[PDB]
Amino acid sequence: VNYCRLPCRGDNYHVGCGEPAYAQECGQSPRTRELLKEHRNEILSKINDVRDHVAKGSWGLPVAARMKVVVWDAELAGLAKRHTKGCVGETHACRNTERFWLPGQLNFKYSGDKLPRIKELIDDAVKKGHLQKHNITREIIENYRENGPNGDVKELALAISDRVTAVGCGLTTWEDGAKARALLTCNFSSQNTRGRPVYKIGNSPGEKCIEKDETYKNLCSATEPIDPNKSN
Ligand SMILES: CCCCC/C=C\C\C=C/C=C/C=C/C[C@@H](O)CCCC(=O)O
Ligand SMILES: [Pr+3]
């Protein structure tokens, strides 16, 4: 759609409006990086692996009643890509779409002497989020607080939201401060709501799916009619 004509509460500019430009903050060697089919599958795979483990009742975390298999969203991905071109993690830009009224977003910054391959950047972000299982409590799951803590849970808690139905990421790499740098941004179809459950508890995993998936046995299939625009 036309993002310059899709308003949002707060009336902030939309990340998607106008022509794509690289931010000055990107220095003078920025390059946007295409997440190819294998990159999108790896991302989907890791996010669905962990959703399946958690919904199972892993880490004493409660069992999940209706946690869905996630799909890639090209629209979210475009907005993510476009966001990385600003070379900055946090902005007040709007990023809503017609389908996903309040998309969550995660940003993974990298800084080092050398630039790792795209796959290595993704595994870094996967590793970072995975490492928060040492931080996420069932308390957090019953009643989302982001801080907390100690310590950080936002990344992992967003990957296991049962309101989330779709993800889309983008990547820009550049050079500044004598370091190779990268911003990896993932937009999600939904977001965790402060004070509300990350996902709804059950006795059996997926006991509330119309249809459980055949690969991620503890999750609802791709066609589960979850509303990503309602919170828990
Ligand atoms: C672009 C990356 C998006 C990051 C989203 C945030 C967190 C997802 C993080 C980790 C997923 C890890 C999967 C690990 C292996 C799999 O067997 C999961 C179970 C391992 C375990 O139970 O500790
Ligand atoms: Pr292509």
Curated annotation (Swiss-Prot):
Motif stretch (Cell attachment site): 9-11
Coiled-coil region(s): none
InterPro entries: CAP_dom, CAP_sf, P14a_insect
Gene Ontology cellular-component terms listed: extracellular region
Pfam families reported in the protein's UniProt record: CAP
Keywords recorded for this protein, A-Z: Disulfide bond, Hemostasis impairing toxin, Platelet aggregation inhibiting toxin, Secreted, Signal, Toxin
The keyword Secreted appears for this protein: yes
GO molecular function: toxin activity
Residues in SCP domain copies: 44-188
Disulfide bond entries: 4-17, 8-94, 26-87, 169-186, 209-220
Binding residues annotated for leukotriene E4, in chain numbering: 59, 130, 133
Tissue-level expression: Expressed in salivary glands.
Annotated localization: Secreted
Family: Belongs to the CRISP family.
Function in brief: Anti-inflammatory scavenger of eicosanoids and antithrombotic protein that inhibits platelets aggregation induced by collagen, ADP and convulxin (GPVI agonist). Exhibits high affinity binding for glycoprotein IIb-IIIa receptor (ITGA2B/ITGB3) and endothelial cell alphaVbeta3 (ITGAV/ITGB3) integrins, but not for alpha-5/beta-1 or alpha-2/beta-1. Accordingly, it blocks endothelial cell adhesion to vitronectin (IC(50)~1 nM) and marginally to fibronectin (IC(50)~1 uM), but not to collagen.
Protein name, as recorded: Tablysin 15
Protein source organism: Tabanus yao (Horsefly)
